[PDB]
Design a protein around this ligand. Structure first.
Ligand SMILES: Nc1ncnc2c1ncn2[C@@H]1O[C@H](COP(=O)(O)OP(=O)(O)OP(=O)(O)O)[C@@H](O)[C@H]1O
Ligand SMILES: Nc1ncnc2c1ncn2[C@@H]1O[C@H](COP(=O)(O)OP(=O)(O)OP(=O)(O)O)[C@@H](O)[C@H]1O
Ligand SMILES: [Mg+2]
Ligand SMILES: [Mg+2]
Lengths: 251, 248
């Protein structure tokens, strides 16, 4: 399909979604999967290894389509949205991002549908915690970054990739173990970005992590087990119930 | 003298003595500077500190992937360069991707200087938390290597553990593991008799993991700012406490 609307809220709904990878049809990854990601909220997606969290992230980028049920963005099936329109409103960051371009400046601007100013580049780098280390180099943002950012440190890489996601001003930001290498100061910066920024209380965030301390301030938590939401709610609500989430935090 | 040592006995006592380092192709950036510490066998030593402080660089030097530009990296009192490269590979294992066209058993067995049994491979896979998902496949361990982030880390960990190295280096190696698997690995390192005599360097930004460590090294701008146990460092009121306070 062909949708590319001017205005977007960012309301995401999975409705009884099922999925198996195309070249492994008999292996159910997601099943009976239902949840809502509300606009301007941080929703955490947590659960055991192999439960399907990264697969959910992939469907949210329309990398694959559900085998059953519906994946909706503002009440419209995702598959109907323009490939490029989606690219502009949906941004995913993983644990080990590939950083294209020859310098920090090019790394951050890469993939953006326009030419940003250095002011804009600097702003998002300050938000992501990348600015300080970048500014420490003689050439600053024009310092050469080699072979897709593999000469940066683990956390420097994540900080740069996050800046690059932020400058797109996406309606849906997906963080998949994306801050696991950040130091405490930068992790704090990202907590402030997620929960104390005026821009991200209007945009919607899917936060996938094994570090449940990061998810405590989430507005909603989804606990995924064997491809479906076992339980969901706030940290305190889930802690009161005494189920999967409780057992994971206490462990 | 390079590559002449391969002793029958390795205590695994590691000493950095006044180590300096800049990467050969970026010589203007001093990464480590006057870096001194000791990793004792029978301890998990956590190496923590800000992004870019040089922690993964310390891991690379400990594998003899680069040489210090100043000072000494000693293993049982001898400079690392003096060990035979194959020998050092039997004694030192680092975990930080899997090999494309090989089976899971071949992936776990990879880098081992002998041929292990399926019982050997299964055992270590249960310890790392890779067993259940591998067993789920119809052909099991014979399946050719797609995996989740945590499953990949579990497989990479089993590969290192099966080498039974004297020095194990974990560089953010469990960041994708779930609570269950993270707990099992911790139990293995802190409770198993085999790891009780070995030396473990645990590099992590998850300060909770650093909390059980027998010793903690706080690295800042390529040098140790302070060190001790969690409870000692919390009392001192320095960089470590500031870091723990920021997260809390
Ligand atoms: N490209 C792929 N092709 C086939 N199977 C896949 C593919 N990617 C993932 N899988 C499988 O789908 C299941 C779900 O994987 P997924 O990566 O979504 O889990 P996860 O919850 O993100 O796990 P983790 O917490 O370890 O990251 C796993 O069993 C995995 O082996
Ligand atoms: N291969 C390389 N060539 C040149 N410089 C490098 C290389 N690898 C890392 N560096 C640089 O050396 C410095 C130390 O990086 P290192 O990865 O050792 O830090 P770290 O303490 O491991 O950081 P993090 O906590 O983010 O993982 C960084 O500023 C980094 O950009
Ligand atoms: Mg995943
Ligand atoms: Mg590192």
């Amino acid at each position: 399909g062909s949708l590319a609307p001017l205005n977007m809220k960012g309301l995401v709904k999975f409705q009884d979604v099922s999925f198996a990878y195309p070249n492994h049809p008999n292996v159910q990854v997601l099943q009976g999967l239902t949840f809502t990601l509300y606009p301007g909220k941080v929703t955490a997606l947590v659960g055991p290894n192999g439960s399907g969290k990264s697969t959910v992230a992939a469907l949210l980028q329309n990398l694959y389509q559900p085998t059953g049920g519906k994946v909706l963005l503002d009440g419209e099936p995702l598959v109907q949205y323009d490939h490029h329109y989606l690219h502009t409103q949906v941004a995913a960051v993983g644990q080990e991002p590939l950083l294209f371009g020859r310098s920090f400046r090019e790394n951050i601007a890469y993939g953006l549908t326009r030419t940003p100013t250095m002011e804009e580049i600097t702003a998002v780098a300050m938000e992501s915690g990348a600015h300080d280390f970048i500014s420490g180099f003689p050439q600053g943002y024009d310092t050469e970054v080699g072979e897709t950012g593999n000469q940066l440190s683990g956390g420097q890489r994540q900080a740069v990739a996050l800046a690059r996601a932020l400058i797109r001003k996406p309606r849906l930001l997906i963080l998949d173990n994306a801050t696991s290498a950040l130091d405490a100061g930068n992790q704090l910066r990202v907590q402030r970005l997620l929960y104390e920024s005026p821009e991200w209380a209007s945009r919607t965030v899917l936060l996938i992590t094994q570090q449940l301390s990061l998810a405590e301030r989430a507005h909603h938590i989804l606990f995924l087990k064997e491809g479906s939401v076992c339980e969901q709610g706030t940290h305190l609500q889930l802690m009161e119930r005494g189920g999967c989430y409780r057992s994971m935090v206490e462990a």
